[PDB]
Write a protein that binds this ligand. Sequence first.
Ligand code: HBQ
Lengths: 539, 400
Amino acid sequence: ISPIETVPVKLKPGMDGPKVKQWPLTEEKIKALVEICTEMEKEGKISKIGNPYNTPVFAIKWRKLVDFRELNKRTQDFWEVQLGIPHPAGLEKKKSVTVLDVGDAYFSVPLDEDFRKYTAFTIPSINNETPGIRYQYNVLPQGWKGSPAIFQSSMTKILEPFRKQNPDIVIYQYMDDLYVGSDLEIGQHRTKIEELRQHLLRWGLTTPDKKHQKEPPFLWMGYELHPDKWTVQPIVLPEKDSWTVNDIQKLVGKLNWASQIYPGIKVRQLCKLLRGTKALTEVIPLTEEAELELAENREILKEPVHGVYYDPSKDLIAEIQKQGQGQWTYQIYQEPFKNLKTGKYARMRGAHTNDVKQLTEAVQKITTESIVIWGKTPKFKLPIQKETWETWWTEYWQATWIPEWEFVNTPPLVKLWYQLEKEPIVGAETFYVDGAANRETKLGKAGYVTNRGRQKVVTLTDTTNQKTELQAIYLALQDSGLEVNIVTDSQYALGIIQAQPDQSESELVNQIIEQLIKKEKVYLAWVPAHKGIGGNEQV
Amino acid sequence: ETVPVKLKPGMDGPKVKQWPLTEEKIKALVEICTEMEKEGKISKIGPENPYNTPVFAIKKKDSTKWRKLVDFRELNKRTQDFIPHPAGLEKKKSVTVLDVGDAYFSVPLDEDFRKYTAFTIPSINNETPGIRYQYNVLPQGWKGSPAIFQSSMTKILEPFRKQNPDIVIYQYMDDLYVGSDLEIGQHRTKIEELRQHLLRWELHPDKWTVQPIVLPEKDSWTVNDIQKLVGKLNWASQIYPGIKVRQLCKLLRGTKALTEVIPLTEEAELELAENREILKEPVHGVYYDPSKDLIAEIQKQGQGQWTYQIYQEPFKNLKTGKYARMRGAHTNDVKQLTEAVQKITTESIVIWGKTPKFKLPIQKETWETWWTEYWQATWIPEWEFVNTPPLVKLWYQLEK
Ligand SMILES: CC[C@H]1C(=O)Nc2ccc(F)cc2N1C(=O)OC(C)C
């Protein structure tokens, strides 16, 4: 009947065909369907039949709608159609690029005859009684689990030839589209498209004539695409006198998206407006800052952000910036100031980490991205001195790495905010710290005793097991000279501190970190708790 | 002719995602994959096949050509079950491994099982739908292959076995392990002899054990010195209950400057002495249990140094060791770790005939995006990522 071989489809093991009841429909909705199903019948898409299985048909001139939700639930799993699709930055410049809407192609593919029975549905009647008009599908049902999958594949095999015959011609199938591009001359190109078209058609595949086919630049996940370059679709920021929560959330969503392409976008103040909101429809007045912030953003969004495609014959370079603690920005280009890509990474907030570490992560994300965008790794231009890197890494407890990179002195630089002494400090006071707190009450004390006789203690209410110890340590730091030694039985220090964090979730920690950073020299030492170990036995 | 291989009861086929690959690697897999398809070893597949297994490309020990590698770990696990370990293999003066992966292609894979062997070749930037294939012959890496081929493997091996007995032959997956006490030249020359034989169709186990811990020795000791010494021993007492810190901890009373020197009491003196002696040997009563999983933990010591232990029960080591990075891996933590894991696994196979489960001191992301870049072995152990406890490190840092 049709060119293409069908693909063998099965119902999930054990399950069986749909058994849904056909809704009752108005006399005018029924007529509309009766007429559509006749045409479809004619065209050969559906077959008259009248089969245990049934699926509900609808009516939205009228346009019909069949609900396969049940069928689907019972349909075997397939090899999923990648939701990961091309990102402009990883595309090539083409002298030309066409698009072939094969919309009607869906219904142009044969359905495993062995499986059609399942698609059986029924046109109702005014007469709740009379025998409904029974049909079933011969081609891929609009809205059926397998459809997407199959169709692409089919398409794929049909191009296998043509592609092979035209190594200098790129074809991209997405949804019910075909982005065919190349570097041939307009006539050569035109001629080839027309060649592609008739080949598809040789398979019962229909495309629109040259006086229908869509035009450049093309819309792609946020960008307008010209065959020589891309520009970001300019984004429109509403202007209202009344802003609801919903409103602010959408906005923020939008703004955030922009941060990648556009530099300087902020939402801190806009985000504030969502505090303690009682309802989506709740109206929140914009504060001054929020009115301002929002303003500078409208200014930034005017600016046209134009970009450059991927030239496979040139270096791939990524440069990074620390826009704040835990905030990083990057741009990937091949030619100074002509980026194929940019982006920023949200202030990842951990339990305890450091900037060098964070930098390393950014680098890995970036890497994984490109491996995809370009199937290649960029040469890194990083705001950190090789000395810094070698100091930190060579000794960090955890396996880490950064691909080929070079130093780039563009403040603010990423550094080691402090380095615990490798050995105890001679002449520096020695604080023997300890903290204890009633497990259950959250009442405790924390203090130290030094070799110089200095002592102290504080009682703390509403505190935990760990918090005291740390506070112990905190105190010691406050009360010591630019050089100190601190002994503790805390397991938590041994790590969290000895692994030298310059940022944390724990505010306390944060404070200790501030303190640590301030000193000239700090040596921390750990000893087993509950031991005859002096100092520890004072505590 | 084929044996009806099946999945463990109620188990379904693997559906693992393909990780992104360097353009280069992709180009190779395609070249490779077309070859195999030509030779009918594999066949492109339909979308009605939802399973998948990751695949990738390597350039193992010394070559200008890429080798296709497939991660059947999941499949393996779901594959039904079906020669014991040569207790002496471990006891030979020298071992050599062999890649007999090829032998497998010479065999058809059960018709109804192939679907599960499905794999996908990517395309940079998803510019092309992946290239789907499924095996027709026994694939390299699947646990089923060495087995269903055991029959013809032994068959072709006997004549060489029976021809020498002073040599041991052990097969693990795609690999073959053989050891002899013969000197270097003879050993090798004999190996080639074996290859030749097979063609027709550097380990020295005697250094592996649990390792010796040595405590510091000093002219004079400081409070700190002693505190550290004490923390170590104290911990160590979870392995040796004879280890004692009583005397030492007494010297630690009062609140002296970390840097003040302390004179050692004769008691403390003997204590140290007594502990040194306890540590002169691995803890007693440690015996490999075949029914349990083998665990292999690793620590980053730094300066390219790496310690590791292989145990089944906590503080009961079957073996411990150090590994020092190879040449030209300097700036590469990942490469070294990768190198070591391979080494530790080979040594695990050699000894008990199976791979351990690793605990890695590296972030999942870091490991995942780069381990394949330095892998060379046909097999692939299991692994999890962890945070190294500071003491475990300091302790094993003390090995002789
Ligand atoms: C077919 C050529 C291919 C490509 O290499 N560069 C461009 C450049 C501009 C475009 F408008 C499209 C495309 N191409 C493509 O497949 O883009 C899809 C995401 C639409």
